[PDB]
Structures are given as C-alpha cells and as structure tokens.
Amino acid sequence: PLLPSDTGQGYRTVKAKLGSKKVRPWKWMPFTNPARKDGAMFFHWRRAAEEGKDYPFARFNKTVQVPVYSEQEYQLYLHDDAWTKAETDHLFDLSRRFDLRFVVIHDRYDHQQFKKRSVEDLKERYYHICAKLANVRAFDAGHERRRKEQLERLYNRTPEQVAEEEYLLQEL
Amino acid sequence: IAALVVDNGSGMCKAGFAGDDAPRAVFPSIVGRPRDSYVGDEAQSKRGILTLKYPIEHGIVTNWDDMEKIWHHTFYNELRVAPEEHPVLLTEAPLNPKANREKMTQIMFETFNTPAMYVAIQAVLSLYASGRTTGIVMDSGDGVTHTVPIYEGYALPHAILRLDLAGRDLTDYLMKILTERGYSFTTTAEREIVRDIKEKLCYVALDFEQEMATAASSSSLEKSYELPDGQVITIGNERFRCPEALFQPSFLGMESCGIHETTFNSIMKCDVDIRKDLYANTVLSGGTTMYPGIADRMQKEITALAPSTMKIKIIAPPERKYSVWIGGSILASLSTFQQMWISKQEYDESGPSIVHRKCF
Amino acid sequence: GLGDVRYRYCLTTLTVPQRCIGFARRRVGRGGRVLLDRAHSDYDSVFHHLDLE
Amino acid sequence: DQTEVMPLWTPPTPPQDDSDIYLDSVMCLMYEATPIPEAK
Amino acid sequence: GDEVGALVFDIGSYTVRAGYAGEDCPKVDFPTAIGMVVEGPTYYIDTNALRVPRENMEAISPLKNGMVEDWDSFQAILDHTYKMHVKSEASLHPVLMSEAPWNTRAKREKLTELMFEHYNIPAFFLCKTAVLTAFANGRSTGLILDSGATHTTAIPVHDGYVLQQGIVKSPLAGDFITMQCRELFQEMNIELVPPYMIASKEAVREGSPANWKRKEKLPQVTRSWHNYMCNCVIQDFQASVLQVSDSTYDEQVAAQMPTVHYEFPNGYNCDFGAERLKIPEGLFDPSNVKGLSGNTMLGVSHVVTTSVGMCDIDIRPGLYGSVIVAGGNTLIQSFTDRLNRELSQKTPPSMRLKLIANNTTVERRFSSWIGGSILASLGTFQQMWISKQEYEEGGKQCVERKCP
Amino acid sequence: QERRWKVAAAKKLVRTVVRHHEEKQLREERGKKEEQSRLRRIAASTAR
Amino acid sequence: EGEVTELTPCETENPMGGYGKTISHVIIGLKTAKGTKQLKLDPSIFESLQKERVEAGDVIYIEAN
Fold this sequence. Notes:
The structure is cut from a larger assembly and holds one copy of chain A (172 residues), one copy of chain B (360 residues), one copy of chain C (53 residues), two copies of chain D, one copy of chain E (404 residues) and one copy of chain G (65 residues).
Chain A: E1 27-32, E2 41-46, H1 85-98, H2 102-107, H3 119-136, H4 141-156, H5 159-171
Antiparallel strand pairs in A: 1-2
Chain C: E1 24-29, E2 33-38
Antiparallel strand pairs in C: 1-2
Chain G: E1 3-11, E2 23-31, E3 36-41, H1 44-51
Antiparallel strand pairs in G: 1-2, 2-3
PDB class: gene regulation
Keywords: complex, chromatin regulator, gene regulation
Chain A: DNA methyltransferase 1-associated protein 1
C-alpha cells in the first residue's frame, strides 16, 4: 500500500539537453504577505526572476459577515426586548470571529455574565435581530427544539428498548 | 561517463569514484587564507601568506566559500575531472540543519552544475560497507562523535547521540600530558608529531589501573621514539592515558558518560524488542580509532554493563578508516540506486527543497 | 455505500510494467509532483482475476 | 467498472466568488428539508 | 520556499520534544526534569548531567498539570536546547509552541513577553496540544485521549476547536504505574538497588540474592534525584512488562503467561507473573482495584461514557468517528485492543464508532509534534503569523485581541 | 504516505546490499573451486 | 516468446567418469514486454539454439511442447 513517485533519471542516458539549458537560479528572497496588514517581511525560495510578484497565495481573504447598530437600531429597527446592547454586541462579535458556528459561539458565549441562554436561544435571538434588520433594511427555533429534544430522548432510549424498537421496525 | 564519490571527513577530505576501493585523493581538510585562498595541503605549503582554516568545524560547515574552493581545487587538481558529466554523491553528519542541506544542494547545482546529485548520512553508508541489516553504529569519527542505531537501513534521529570529541581532542590531551611529562608541543608540526606518536605507540589499556602499575613498574611500556629532530621520547603510561579519557571525560576536566556508557544510553533510547540484536551488531568508526586493546576492552566493558542475558557480538572492522567512503562507492555502484539520483532540471523545476522532498 | 467523498479508488495497470495495480488513485504532492496512491482493500491479496469473473 | 481516466486530488484555489458549503455528520436523512414537519 | 526556517516545540507530560518544521520527527528530546545542586546554580539537564551520578541533586520538574512552574527553569532549558542541540539564533527564525487546555492567560502573556524581548524571536504562535495531534490525524472533530506521564485525560475537538467542557484530569498515568510497581515490589519484597551504585553485577540466578559490587567513587545523592532515577528504572521495567488482559481479568489466566525473565541493575533476575495483568485491569476500572478501592477515577469505559455523554447529541457521531491516543504512558500493551473491546461493550452500537489507527511509538507519542509541523508547513497559515513588530507595538496584550 | 514509502525504500536497499555481499562471497568460493578443479584437470592431462 | 536476456548451463560432474565438465541442463533468461524469467532447458537444446543465430538482444519462438 505504498506510493511510487515520479522518476526522471531512470538511467545514465541523458548526457545532453543540459548544456543548452541553464538552471534558472533560486534565491532565499524576502517578501511580504498582504493578508498580514502589518506586512511582515518573510522569505521565499523564489527562482530569482520571480521577484516582486504579489503574494499569489493571499487571495483567499474571504470571511464571515455580520451587521452592526449604533444608537437606534437596537431601539428603533432591531429594537431589543430581552438582550442588552452589550449582549447583542457580544453575540455578534463571537459570530464574526467564529464565522457562524453557533455551537462554538454558545460554548464560548458567557452564559453567567450575559443572560443564561441555550445555544438555540442565541440562535433564535440572532434570527430575530438579523431578520428585523434585513426586512427594515430590505430560523425555526421551536420546531427544531422539539426535534432536538425528540432526538436526545431517542438517543437516551435504553439500548435494550432501542433493540426491541428496531426489532419491531424490521419485523414490519 | 564516470561515478563520483565524495567523503568529507571531519578534518580530512577523501574523495573517489564509485567502484573504486580507495579514495582518488586524500588530504587534510584545511583552508588557506591570504592576509588567492588555497586548499588543504596546498594552503599548508604556503603557510607564510596563507593561514590554516578548518571549514569543517565541530564536524560542521563554517563558510560556503571555503568548501566551494576546496571543491574547486579538488576538481581542478586532484580529480582533474569534469564532474558536470557525472553524478555527485555527498555525505553528511546526522541531525544536520536543513539550512546546510539546501545550501550545499544549491551550491552544487549553480556553482558546478552537475547532472545527478544525492546525499546520505556517513554512518549508514559505513554500515552498508559493513554488510549487515540491523544494528547500532558508533560514530567514532575524526572530529565529532555520534551513536547511530540504524534499523532496516533506517535510523531514528532522536535515538542518536552526539559528542564533539574525536582524534583532535584526544591529540590535544596527549600533547598536554606529553608537555607535562617535561616536553613541549606548540606549533602545527608539534601537533602532527604528537598525532604521529599516538598513531605509532599509543594503545588502549585493558585494566587501566594494573596498566598503571605495569607502566610504573614494567618499563616495557615506556618506549623510545625518534622525534623528527631525532630526540628519543620515553613513553609509558601516556601510551594509553589519553584513550582511557574516552570512557572518563574527567581526564580532560569534562563530565559525561563514557563511550560505552553513551552507547548503553543510546541502545536504551531505542526499543527493547531488538536491543539484543543491536548488541549482536556493534560497530566501530574512524581511522583514528583502531588503537590496540580498544575493541577487546570495549567488548569487555559492554559485556559487564550490558546484561549478559543478551548476546554482545562486537564488530571491529580493522579497515574502517574509509568505511563511509567504501559504502558510498558500493551504493553508487548499485542498479536500483541509479534511478534515485536527482537531475539538474529537477532542481530547476522544484528548487533546493526538492532535496528534502526526495533526497533521503 | 459508506459514503466517503475523497476515498474513491479504482483499478488500472501501468504503462511499462503493465499489471493489475490494485485500487489506486493519482494525487498531487509537494513540489507539484503527482503521486499514485495504491489502496489496500477487501481484495488486496487477490488483485488478479480479470474478465470480471 | 466508456472506460474513463481516473480523477485527481489537488490543492485549493483562490475564491473568485463564495462557494460556501458545509457538510453535516448525520449522513442518514435526505439532505434538502422536511415537507411537513408538523401541522405548519 | 513557502516555508521559512521555523522551529516547532512540543513538551508533553513525560518528555520534551522539538524539531524543524515540516520534518518527519522531532530532532531531539530529553527528560522533562532537571537536576538541581543548590550552591547561576548547578543545573543538571539531559542524561550526562541528570542520570549520571553526582552530589546533592534536587531534581525539579518545571511542569505541573500542564502548567508553568519555574520560569527560570524554562529559560535555562530553552538555552540548553539552543546551545547543546540546535546551535542557532532563533531570533533569525520564527518559532511557536503548543499550549495546555487551561494555561493561565497570565503565564501565556509572561512567556510571550519573555520570548519576544529576551529570545528576540521574529514571530510566535500558540495553540492547544490536542489540536495539534488532531491535525496530525487530519481530523476536525474527534476525541483525544492522552496517557501522558502525569494524567490520563480526554478532550474532544470540533472543526479543529476543542470543547472546553470535555477536559478530564484523571490522575492515573505512568506515575500510577510506578505506584503499582512499587506495591508489587512491596508484596513480593524487592528493594531498589539503582544501577549507578553497582560497580559490577555478578552472576546470579532467579531467586538468587542480589550479587553486585559498588564503585567506591560515588558521592552521595539526594533522595529526590535518586528516587527519580529509580523511577526511570521502574518505567523501563514496566515497558519490559507492559501488558493488559484483553477481557475480564482472572488471576490464573494472567498467570498462564510464562513468567518473563526480567533482570535488574544488580544482576539479579526473577520471573514475573499474573501481577502485570492484575494491575492494569484497574486502569479500565479503578473500582475493581484489589486493596485500593479507587472510585474517584473513572474506568476506561467509564471515561468513554462520561466524555460521550457530556457532549451534545448531533456531533457525538462525529467524535465517535475518531479516537486518539497520546502520552509517555501510552506505551502500554493491549492498550487499543482492550480499549475498543470496552467500547464495543459499553459504547452502544446506536452510533457508529471509529478509532484512529496509529500504534508506532513515533506516532503514538509525537503525533502532537507531527501536527505542529504539519500546520507550520501549510502555505495559507502565513497570514496567521504573529510579527514581533505587532508585539512591540501592543505589548504582550495583543494576545487577547488576536487570541481568544 | 511519505513516511510509509521511505521505510520501504530503506528496506529494499538493505535487501539489495545483503544480496550483493552474498554473490560476492559465492563467486569467490566458486572461483577457488574451479581453479582447483582445473589444476586437477591439467594433472589429468599429465596423466593422459 | 521474449528476448534472450542471458544463458547459462547447469554444470555438474556427477556423470560417470571422465573429467566432470558436464552440463546437467541449460538456464535461459528470457524477457517479454510483460516481464522477465528463465526456464530449465535440457542439454540437447543448446545444440539446437547453436543451430539458430541465438545472440544476446533478439527474440525467439520456443515451442513449449
């Protein structure tokens, strides 16, 4: 279960084709990455001639996107009812940094300092906030909560009981 | 067509061609430097305006220009060959930083532009010369020391041990004790003369204490040597006082495990499952390491410290001064290894890092 | 049926040393070098039937 | 099992436009939605 | 050259590891501990200083529950590394290190400050060890088990992110195995004759009295240092004897093994029987430990159940897709086989289970270092560097802003 | 995969070298044997 | 079929009497594009292949039965 690798030599049969072909040199040249705003100067083994070319590999600057409010949205459009401006801000910051991994956000959301809220509580709250912002500036918490409690009940279903449930189902 | 083998000893370069039994040319690896920088013995001959220099410090490179020029002069005078129509095989000490590997690869490719290149550790090539599968290699080289447990022609960098003690430090200590005996040894000539006296009469004591008793009682140990000036030197206990320092770093004020103690440490660093086999597969290294009473004494010491429940079968090739180069010639003379070479266009298409991608 | 998106392997033979290679797939490697990775599956030891017995 | 050359695995590419995708681990149900989860 | 000459460092519960980036194996390693002879002072590091006998060593482990203890010791050990092994100016070379699940932000800031100011490092980075190991397996959401020399901990991961909740600081480790060896010696009454105090180990048979010679030149050592080198001997013995019953333990079943002829530094060599399998079975359940009614610890299957249950439902299948091992004490034989048996038994078949196939010593221990080098190699990561210029700008406080 | 592959390379190299040593010694021995056989044959030519 | 790779005898002095310079049978290394191999060849066939211009680097039609 190994892997052969490319072989170019094979045999001493290649006397020529080199004297006419210079080995393009390589240098441990410095460089800067655009993705680093400070533009830290690092190094590459570029082939000399390939000097000054923009950092070709930093074109992946795709990120999450979260909205913002200043003084009225939290009171006019996205007018809050249960959260603090601080709680909305903290949620949105955790979202921006975590790029919308709600389980990650909740497990890394302060439940004590901010209002204690399940992961789906934060999910539904954000749904309200973002949908209000979208429509004014122009997602199913309940059913999913029911389905999830059902899921965990079935999971906790004692293994023997699961066994007879499956035995019936197959017996059909 | 030709096949090139390059063995770079800690302080002497010894190159040759695959299939050969012995290196083409041999000489100490020192570099001159004007206050044209000349090479090895070439520089030595011009000591007045060229200053001795050791590019292989600690068994390691110092300045790329120095070995650039050693290769320059090598090719142009000793080999007097066109390596750029032949593969170039090179060797290295273990645990070498990747920096040195890429640097030497680039220097080869650009400066000299030879088609086929490849690198491999000295110890494993010497083992290949030794014709055995699994075992532990002691790198009693010339400038630095290492202990390489090689398995299935494959070694674990962690398990290796290092120590920069070798013939140079042994010669320095022997010079020191000989001066203490009432002599003096200062310049290069004196250093080489001390090394000569060592190579002639120095040996490894069996029971160092009863050996002292015999040297101080049996004058037979005290012997006569014609110095270059002609002076006759009585040399008794000092024939073997220095070698015992190998197991006793305290001799030189240093503190560490003796050579065989180091080896036991290493074999412990391995896996127990095959340490019996390793014991069965001892090794030796270094042309400056064949001194009488050495292999047997080391055998006794391992038998003592190594549990007797395992078989301790020593391996002491009396011809090991070139083991590494000989293994290199053997390897370069193998069919399946020819494919494994690395071409110039391969560097041109992948850069120096291709060595760390393929050269293993 | 296991549903592994990337572990899709296939049989083939080679050009010069033609023979049943076994479930294998090409894959790129460092230095822009393609490499053939030959798998090891339920029929690893019996990789010579031919004709779809 | 007409006969076709095998695929390849390659590094990624710069994102011209978002190809946002995630894969769940349930790997059991059909991956679009539920038509009538309840009396909706 | 999308890789710069970076160096990765890996320090575990048992030993200290490090090596260049992108390489197969860490370059070097040496004991986690250092021998202290109070009088700057005399530091004994690596075998030549530590195991080799000297006078008045008080060996000190600068680690504790994966925490920084002796900052001066850490600085000295870094300098020892540099000189004795690497011989390079990392100020010219980017570096990074793993981190514990619980390392104090205060100590992380302290070390960041120290690195940047003293060591003059050009760049730095941090991340949790388990994350590195999970990378090593090419995994994004799994459960990590490590029997490092200190603890026997389990920590799950998701999308390359640890679940803070999953930490289990079980005590049992190679320390526990040393305690087991000690109680074995007690019940069968063999003292500890360390090798260093033995000039010659004279011929002796099974049951034979310890016959040996002492080398008069042996300045006395401390109980700390001597006991710890004895502990190294004990761990060697364990390795020589490592094994666990693959099923419900039975005294006579374990005794059925041919008593292995293990030799000791004195030269004595007796044969050991069912004890080596009676002992480990407690690792899988501390309650069954005869004599010691350990209950606070969770048996192996009990640890599995705890870790699985404490997660959420949706990803638990994902975690079950992976199971990982790590640590100096993970050398145990019958480790993974009996682990998976206990799984199949206690772990319900409801959720598909899948482990990680890696048992070589190299993988089994330095998977974490492998993952670290793996990350260093990646070409995209360079935007995630930590330039020393940014640290100069914003103090060591930039860590909180850039590291959550 | 690279880990898997270089270990195999080392193994195959070991096999190659051990085989090489083997035929070297076998050739030595058989050369000696042929030499003595040829000597017996020339002595049998004397006998002829 | 294949290309003649090598050719060797199976020497043996066992035959009754005489200088034992005798061949038990011949060994012929043959290579097709599929691969390479060798087979056991009786002594008499070496005379035959003498008859043909058998030389390293050519192919041949060896009727098995």
